[PDB]
Design a protein around this nucleic acid. Structure first.
Lengths: 122, 80, 80, 85
RNA sequence: ACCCGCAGAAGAAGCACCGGCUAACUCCGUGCCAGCAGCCGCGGUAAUACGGAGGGUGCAAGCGUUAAUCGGAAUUACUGGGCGUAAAGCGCACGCAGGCGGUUUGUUAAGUCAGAUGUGAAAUCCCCGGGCUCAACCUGGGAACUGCAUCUGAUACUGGC
RNA sequence: GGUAGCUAAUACCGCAUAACGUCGCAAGACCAAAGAGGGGGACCUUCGGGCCUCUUGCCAUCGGAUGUGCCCAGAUGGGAUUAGCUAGUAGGUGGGGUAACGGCUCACCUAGGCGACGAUCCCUAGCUGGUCUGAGAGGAUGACCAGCCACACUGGAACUGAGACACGGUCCAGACUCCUACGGGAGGCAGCAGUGGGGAAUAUUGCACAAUGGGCGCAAGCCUGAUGCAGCCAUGCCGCGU
């Protein structure tokens, strides 16, 4: 499960295999992150085709978990990687032009549908 | 008749092939001195009668193999 | 098809035209077998204007290359 | 409008299911003729080669192997039955 | 296109340069300041060097400034460089692989010289016939492109034997 | 645009016939396909053809004409403070492959092959007709132009056809732009033109199937940002005003 000091691959286009989870947020004491809810990330490698800097502090949201999406019936829909997508801290919204993720029901429960819907996978 | 060139054998170390050196002897285009511009060719030889120091006469086909288009006509000096 | 045809030649508002034998196949005025004449649509109303090698064309037609309506009518300008 | 080149891969794969299938049949026919030389000799080989002869010409009549390979196959095997003693 | 008329000096001129080399130059103001300069160098009370002014010089629908290429440039040197010092000759001995080598004969023909047949695309130079005055351009006929290959002589020199 | 029911061939396959082709000294066996159109009389009918006539096609064999595939030779940017380099590199044995060649592509035996005439490796790069310069030699350089070789957003495979190693194609993938109120979907201006960006900088989303060519059609005719012409600029050259 995703938590503080976890290294992940990123769902943002031209993002590197390595970004670091520095805070799990929620204001109260928190163990692990949650799908469709925010997390604090630092960029540990930057790709020159991408739009981010190494060592920069950013806002993100969790978009796929090895724990799967499973609330309504207990029937799990599962993925073979843990990943988040990057959000702007003032203007809001996913900062990329493509997302590498399943873009499930709880991501369309956010204000983001216009920039995630190019490829629905479930 | 046919066109043939003269040379000397520089390697025989290959089962059905030999290597021959030929001298085209050409004038330098600016400074006018004549230069050998010696060229080493691989030559087809199934009869295998030659060795280091033999003077030979050769002809072109047809490409016989990769980097080989010449074949042996006659042995010229038949010395030693 | 080897054809006897008119080739693109002239100036802005002043076309001149040449006639050549070529397989087509080949592109515009290039890579032709031989030239046989020139048209000049004006020809300055003179007998030293417009020329056609009617005897070499006679050896290139038969039993030879094709000649279409507009090119078979060049003989009518030299008349002949 | 059209671009008939967009039809030619489909027209080739639909035909491949016979036009390449017969290449496998023809590769096999060489085996049937060499198997008739061990069945064997002059009283089996030239009788069995005459099962292959018309099929090679009947394929060449449609194109595909017409430029040399069809006549090449017939000549190659005519020379192999002529070699018999 | 071309022809005929209506039209009135009417609508039409620049930019650089002038101490010595270097064409044309004097006076004002500034007073080592400001503003200049291809090199020699300008400016403190005559500035022919700045800015202006009056007169000249140059080219012209152009005139001028630059980072640069060719000329001047034989100062990159083949046509056609240089090594005592001015800048380069190794402190010295021997020598493989390279370059070079007397002379009488024959022979090979790589190389040279001679003669042909193919080819060296079309534009195009140059000669020259048309088309617009000249010409750019479209061309009609010529020429050259010393080349290269394939056949064939000379048989002298060089390499080879 | 997918599927199913239905129906015909100048769409398709067999059964026939078949040359100087196949292979051989040779007799000889074998492989194929389409009619159509305009005109037109006697005889006959259910008078949307029996039948005559010319044209043009269809299937095959073998030559010319012209290309396409292949390998060489002479010509050829820099670097030696790169001196050694290499394992399909270098030779043989056997298959397969192509219209055809070769290691061309494989599997195995052999260890040679290439170097101071610079191998090996690395940087730079459309080439030549041409262009400018000066008396020329020589130098600096190859826009446009004619021809030739390569390229089609970035990349692989090659297929069709007479031909592409396919600007306006296939299977798509990558980087993407655009559409979707959200269930998957179209495409590649280094064509013709504008525009965002890059730059000290290079012209208009001009007019027209009028002429010409190519393409289909037996021909009338239809298609054509091919092409043919405008528009703008001291940017170079030439004749000429004020």
């Amino acid at each position: 499960m995703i938590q503080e000091q976890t290294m992940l691959n990123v769902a943002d286009n031209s993002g590197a295999r390595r970004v670091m989870c520095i805070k799990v947020l929620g204001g109260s004491h928190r163990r692990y992150a949650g799908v469709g809810d925010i997390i604090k990330i630092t960029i540990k490698e930057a790709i020159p085709r991408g739009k981010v800097k190494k060592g920069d502090v950013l806002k993100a949201v969790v978009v796929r978990t090895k724990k799967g999406v499973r609330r309504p019936d207990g029937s799990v829909i599962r993925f073979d990687g843990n990943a988040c997508v990057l959000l702007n801290n003032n203007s809001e919204q996913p900062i990329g032009t493509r997302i590498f993720g399943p873009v499930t029901r709880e991501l369309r429960s956010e204000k983001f549908m216009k920039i995630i819907s190019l490829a629905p996978e479930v | 008749k046919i066109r043939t060139l003269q040379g000397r054998v520089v390697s025989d170390k290959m089962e059905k092939s030999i290597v021959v050196a030929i001298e085209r002897f050409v004038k330098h285009p600016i400074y006018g001195k004549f230069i050998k511009r010696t060229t080493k060719l691989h030559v087809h030889d199934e009869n295998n009668e030659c060795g280091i120091g033999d003077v030979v006469e050769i002809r072109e086909c047809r490409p016989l193999s990769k980097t080989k288009s010449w074949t042996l006509v006659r042995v010229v000096e038949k010395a030693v | 098809m080897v054809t006897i045809r008119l080739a693109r030649h002239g100036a802005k508002k002043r076309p001149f035209y040449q006639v050549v034998v070529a397989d087509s196949r080949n592109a515009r005025n290039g890579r032709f077998i031989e030239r046989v004449g020139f048209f000049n649509p004006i020809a300055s109303e003179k007998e030293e204007g417009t020329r056609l090698d009617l005897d070499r064309i006679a050896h290139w037609v038969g039993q030879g290359a094709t000649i279409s309506d507009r090119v078979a009518a060049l003989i009518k300008e030299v008349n002949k | 409008n059209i671009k008939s080149a967009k039809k030619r891969a489909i027209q080739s794969e639909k035909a491949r299911k016979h036009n390449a299938s017969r290449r496998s049949m023809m590769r096999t026919f060489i085996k049937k003729v060499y198997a008739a030389i061990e069945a064997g000799d002059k009283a089996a080989a030239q009788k069995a080669f005459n099962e292959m002869q018309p099929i090679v010409d009947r394929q060449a009549a449609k194109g595909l192997i017409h430029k040399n390979k069809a006549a090449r196959h017939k000549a190659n095997l005519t020379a192999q039955i002529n070699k018999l003693a």
